[PDB]
Amino acid sequence: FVNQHLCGSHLVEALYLVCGERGFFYTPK
Amino acid sequence: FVNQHLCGSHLVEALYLVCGERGFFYTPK
Amino acid sequence: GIVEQCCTSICSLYQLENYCN
Amino acid sequence: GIVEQCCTSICSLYQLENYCN
Numbered sequence: 211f212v213n214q215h216l217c218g219s220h221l222v223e224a225l226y227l228v229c230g231e232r233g234f235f236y237t238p239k
Numbered sequence: 240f241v242n243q244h245l246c247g248s249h250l251v252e253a254l255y256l257v258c259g260e261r262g263f264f265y266t267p268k
Numbered sequence: 269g270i271v272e273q274c275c276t277s278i279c280s281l282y283q284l285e286n287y288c289n
Numbered sequence: 290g291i292v293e294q295c296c297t298s299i300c301s302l303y304q305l306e307n308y309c310n
Contacts, residue, residue, distance in 0.1 A: 212300055212301060212305055213300065213301060213302075214299060214300065215295070215297070215298070217292070217295075217296035217297075219252060219255055221292070222251050222254075223251070224300065224305055225251075225308055225309070226247075226251045226265070228306060228309065229306070229309035229310070232309040232310045233265040233266040233267050233268075233310045234265055235263075235264050235289075235308055235310065236262040236264075236308065237262040237289055237290060238260060238290065239262075239293075241279055242279065242281075243279065244274070244277070244278060245279045246276075250270065250271070250274055253274075254287055254288070257288065258284075258287070258288035263287045263288045263289060264287055264310075266269060266270065266310055267270060267271045
């Protein structure tokens with residue numbers, strides 16, 4: 211799932227799924 | 240939608256929807 | 269932290285907005 | 290930034306993981 215265009219809520223979801231317990235920072239700038 | 244139990248991907252989605260262009264930091268600790 | 273405040277207890281706008289950049 | 294790299298162009302695992310804490 212990560213090797214595609216990921217926009218809006220799909221991007222945030224990809225980051226949630228990938229970073230797990232770490233969490234993540236989202237800055238769409 | 241924000242005045243409820245928001246867990247897992249629902250929480251990340253709530254933060255996406257609320258913080259808009261700012262973005263946000265997710266640390267589930 | 270966020271899971272404590274918003275998942276295992278009820279969330280609020282004020283708390284969500286504390287996590288915005 | 291992320292929208293540039295992952296939405297208007299194709300994303301990758303390496304780039305997603307740069308945004309993890």
